[PDB]
Coordinates of C-alpha atoms in Angstrom, one line a residue:
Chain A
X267 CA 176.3 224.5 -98.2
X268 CA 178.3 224.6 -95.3
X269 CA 178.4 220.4 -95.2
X270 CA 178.6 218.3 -98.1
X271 CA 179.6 214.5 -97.7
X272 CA 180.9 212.3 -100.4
X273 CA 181.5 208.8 -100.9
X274 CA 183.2 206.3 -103.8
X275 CA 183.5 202.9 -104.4
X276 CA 187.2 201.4 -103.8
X277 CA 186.1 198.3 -105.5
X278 CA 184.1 199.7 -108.8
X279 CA 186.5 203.0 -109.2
X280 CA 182.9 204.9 -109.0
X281 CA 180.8 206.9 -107.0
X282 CA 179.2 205.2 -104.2
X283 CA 175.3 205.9 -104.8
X284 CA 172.0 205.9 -103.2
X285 CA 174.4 205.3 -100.1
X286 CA 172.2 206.8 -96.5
X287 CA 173.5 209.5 -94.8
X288 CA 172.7 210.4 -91.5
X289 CA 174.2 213.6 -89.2
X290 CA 173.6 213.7 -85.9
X291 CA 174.3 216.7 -83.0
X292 CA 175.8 215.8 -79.8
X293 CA 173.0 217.1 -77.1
X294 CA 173.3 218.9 -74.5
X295 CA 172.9 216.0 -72.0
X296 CA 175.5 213.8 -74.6
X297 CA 172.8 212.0 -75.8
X298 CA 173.2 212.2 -80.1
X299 CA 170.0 214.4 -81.8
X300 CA 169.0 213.6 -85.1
X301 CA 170.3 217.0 -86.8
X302 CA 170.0 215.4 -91.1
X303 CA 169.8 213.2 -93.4
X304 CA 170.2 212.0 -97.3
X305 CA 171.5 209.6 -99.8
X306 CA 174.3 210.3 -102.0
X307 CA 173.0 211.3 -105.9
X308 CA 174.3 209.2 -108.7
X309 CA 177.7 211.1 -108.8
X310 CA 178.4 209.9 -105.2
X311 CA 177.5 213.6 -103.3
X312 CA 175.3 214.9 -100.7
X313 CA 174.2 218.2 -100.6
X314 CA 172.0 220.4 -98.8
X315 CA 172.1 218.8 -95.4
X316 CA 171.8 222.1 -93.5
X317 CA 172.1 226.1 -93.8
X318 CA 174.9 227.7 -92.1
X319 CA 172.2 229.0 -89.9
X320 CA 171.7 225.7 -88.7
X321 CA 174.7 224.2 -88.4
X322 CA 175.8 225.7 -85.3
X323 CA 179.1 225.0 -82.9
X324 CA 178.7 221.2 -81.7
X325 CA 179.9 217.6 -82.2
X326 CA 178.7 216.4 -85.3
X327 CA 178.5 212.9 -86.0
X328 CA 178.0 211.5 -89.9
X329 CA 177.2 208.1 -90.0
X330 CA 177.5 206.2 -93.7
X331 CA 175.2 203.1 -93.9
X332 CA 177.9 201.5 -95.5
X333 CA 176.6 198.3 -94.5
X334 CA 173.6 198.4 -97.0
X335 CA 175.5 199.4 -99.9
X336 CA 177.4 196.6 -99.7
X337 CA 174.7 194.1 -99.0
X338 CA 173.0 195.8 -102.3
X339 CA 176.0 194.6 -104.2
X340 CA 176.0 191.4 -103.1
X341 CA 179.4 191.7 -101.1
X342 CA 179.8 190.9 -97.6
X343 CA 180.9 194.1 -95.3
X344 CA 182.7 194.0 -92.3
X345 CA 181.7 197.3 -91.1
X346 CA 177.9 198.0 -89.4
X347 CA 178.6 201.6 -90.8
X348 CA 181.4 204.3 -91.0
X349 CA 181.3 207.1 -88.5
X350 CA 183.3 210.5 -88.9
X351 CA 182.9 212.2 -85.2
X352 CA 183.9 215.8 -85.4
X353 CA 183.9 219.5 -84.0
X354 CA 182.6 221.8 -86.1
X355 CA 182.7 225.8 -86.2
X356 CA 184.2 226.2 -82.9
X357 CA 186.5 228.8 -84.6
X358 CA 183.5 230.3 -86.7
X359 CA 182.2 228.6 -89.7
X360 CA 184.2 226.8 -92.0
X361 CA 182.7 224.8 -95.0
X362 CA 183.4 221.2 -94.2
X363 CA 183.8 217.8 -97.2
X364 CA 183.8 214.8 -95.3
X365 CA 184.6 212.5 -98.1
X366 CA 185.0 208.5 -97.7
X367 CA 186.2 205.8 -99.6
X368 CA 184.6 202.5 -99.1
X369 CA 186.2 198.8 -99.5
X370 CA 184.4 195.7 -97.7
X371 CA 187.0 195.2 -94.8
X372 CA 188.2 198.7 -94.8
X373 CA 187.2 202.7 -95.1
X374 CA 189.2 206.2 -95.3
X375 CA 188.1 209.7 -94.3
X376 CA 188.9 212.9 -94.8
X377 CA 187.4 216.3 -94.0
X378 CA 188.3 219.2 -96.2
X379 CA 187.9 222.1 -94.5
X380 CA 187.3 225.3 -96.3
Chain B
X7 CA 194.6 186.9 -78.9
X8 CA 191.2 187.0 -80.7
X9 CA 191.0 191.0 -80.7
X10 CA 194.4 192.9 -81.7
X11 CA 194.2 197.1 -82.4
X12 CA 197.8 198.3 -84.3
X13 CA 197.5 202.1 -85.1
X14 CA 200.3 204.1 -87.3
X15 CA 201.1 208.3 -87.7
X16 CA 200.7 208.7 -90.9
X17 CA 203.0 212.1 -90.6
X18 CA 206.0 210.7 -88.3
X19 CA 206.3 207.7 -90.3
X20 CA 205.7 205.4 -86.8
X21 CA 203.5 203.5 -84.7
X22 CA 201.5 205.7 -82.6
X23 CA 202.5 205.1 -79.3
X24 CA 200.3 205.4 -75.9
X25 CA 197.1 206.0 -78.4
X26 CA 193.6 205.3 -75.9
X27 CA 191.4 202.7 -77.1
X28 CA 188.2 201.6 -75.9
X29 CA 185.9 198.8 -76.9
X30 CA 182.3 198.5 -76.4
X31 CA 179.8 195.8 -76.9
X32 CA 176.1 196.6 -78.1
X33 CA 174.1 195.4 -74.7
X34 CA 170.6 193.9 -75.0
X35 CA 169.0 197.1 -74.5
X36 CA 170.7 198.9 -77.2
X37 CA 173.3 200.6 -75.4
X38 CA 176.9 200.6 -75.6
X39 CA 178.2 198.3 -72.5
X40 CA 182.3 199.1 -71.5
X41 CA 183.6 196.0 -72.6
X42 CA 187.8 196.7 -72.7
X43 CA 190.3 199.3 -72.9
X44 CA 194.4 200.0 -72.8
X45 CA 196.7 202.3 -74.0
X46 CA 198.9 200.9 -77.7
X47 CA 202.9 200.1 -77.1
X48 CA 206.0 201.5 -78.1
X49 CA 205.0 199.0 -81.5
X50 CA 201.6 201.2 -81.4
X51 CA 200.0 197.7 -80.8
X52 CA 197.4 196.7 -78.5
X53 CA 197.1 193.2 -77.1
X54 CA 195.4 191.3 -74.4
X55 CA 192.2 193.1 -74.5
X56 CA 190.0 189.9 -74.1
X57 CA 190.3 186.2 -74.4
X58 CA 188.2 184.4 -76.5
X59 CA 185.9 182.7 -73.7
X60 CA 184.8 186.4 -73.1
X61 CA 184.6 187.3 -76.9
X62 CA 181.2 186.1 -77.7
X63 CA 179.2 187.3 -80.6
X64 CA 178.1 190.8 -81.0
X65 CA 178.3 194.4 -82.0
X66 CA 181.6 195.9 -81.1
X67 CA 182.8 199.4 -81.6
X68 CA 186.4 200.3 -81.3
X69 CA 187.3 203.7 -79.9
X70 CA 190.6 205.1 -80.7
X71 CA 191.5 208.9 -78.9
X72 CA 192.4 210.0 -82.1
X73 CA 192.1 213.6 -80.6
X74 CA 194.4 213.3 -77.6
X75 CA 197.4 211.6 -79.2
X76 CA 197.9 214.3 -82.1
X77 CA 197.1 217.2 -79.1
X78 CA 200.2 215.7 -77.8
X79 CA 202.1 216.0 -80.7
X80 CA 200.7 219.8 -80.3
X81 CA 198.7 219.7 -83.6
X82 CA 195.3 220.1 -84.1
X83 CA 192.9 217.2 -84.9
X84 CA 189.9 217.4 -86.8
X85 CA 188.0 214.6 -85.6
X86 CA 187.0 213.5 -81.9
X87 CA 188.2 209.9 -82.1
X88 CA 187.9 207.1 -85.2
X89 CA 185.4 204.8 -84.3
X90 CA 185.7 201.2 -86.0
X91 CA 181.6 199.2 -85.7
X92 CA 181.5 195.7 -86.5
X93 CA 179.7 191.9 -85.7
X94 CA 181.7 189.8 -84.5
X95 CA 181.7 185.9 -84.4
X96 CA 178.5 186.0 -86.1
X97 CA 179.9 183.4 -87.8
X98 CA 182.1 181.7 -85.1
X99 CA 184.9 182.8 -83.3
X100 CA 187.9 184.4 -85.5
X101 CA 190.9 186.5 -84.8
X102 CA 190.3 190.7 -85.4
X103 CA 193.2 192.8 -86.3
X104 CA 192.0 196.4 -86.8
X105 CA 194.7 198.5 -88.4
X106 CA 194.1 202.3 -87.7
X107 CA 196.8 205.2 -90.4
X108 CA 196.6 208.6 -88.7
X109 CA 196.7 211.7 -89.8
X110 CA 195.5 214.9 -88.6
X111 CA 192.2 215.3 -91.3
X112 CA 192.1 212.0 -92.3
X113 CA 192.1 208.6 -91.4
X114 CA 191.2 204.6 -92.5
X115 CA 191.0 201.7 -90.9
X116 CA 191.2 197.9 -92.2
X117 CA 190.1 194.7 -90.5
X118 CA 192.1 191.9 -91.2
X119 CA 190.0 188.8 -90.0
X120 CA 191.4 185.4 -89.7

């Protein structure tokens, strides 16, 4: 599992769930490829987006429908989505957490790299 | 001012100065249309990006060279840029700060909307 995303709730103190994920791979004419996709399980995780024979040197983009979730809870977002843009592998492969925490008006990211 | 961008290092304890930013506005045809761009102050604030007569409704994403500013500093970024996606005036015209904390694997932004 060389990337695993995860995402909680700022405003329940739980794991965000059933929340869509989807990766994308910069192309080479910089146009984004769809490259995966999931929802988080019920304790806020996704897993198994790729093999490491898959996930190659590129830009990876990870975009959290945040939006949705929100919308599903009644609450009103500000965000259309979160998006963590990143590098990945240049250096060889690494395993790579992208975890975010979700509010309405406001979102953090981190990548634990491993 | 209906559009201000304020960005802070997280590690330095300071504004981040002469951070890149670049707006764009979801164009009829789905693409992303240049809309404004500038560099933050010495206050790592960015004003005078639009004016509200050119500040319509739409889909706005906020760029921020996350990557550049902490290359600078000579330390290596994980992601390419924070991106900040949102609707604006949806609901009529209103004033955007959107608050960026920097650090070098993480980062969160909040939209303060009045």
């Amino acid at each position: 599992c060389p990337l695993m995303v995860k995402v909680l709730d700022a405003v329940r103190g739980s794991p965000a769930i059933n929340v869509a994920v989807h990766v994308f791979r910069k192309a080479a004419d910089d146009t984004w490829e769809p490259f995966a996709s999931g929802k988080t399980s019920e304790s806020g995780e996704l897993h198994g987006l790729t093999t490491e024979e898959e996930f190659v040197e590129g830009i990876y983009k990870v975009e959290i429908d945040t939006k949705s979730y929100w919308k599903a809870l009644g609450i009103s977002p500000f965000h259309e989505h979160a998006e963590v843009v990143f590098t990945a592998n240049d250096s060889g492969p690494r395993r790579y957490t992208i975890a975010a925490l979700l509010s309405p008006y406001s979102y953090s990211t981190t990548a634990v790299v491993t």
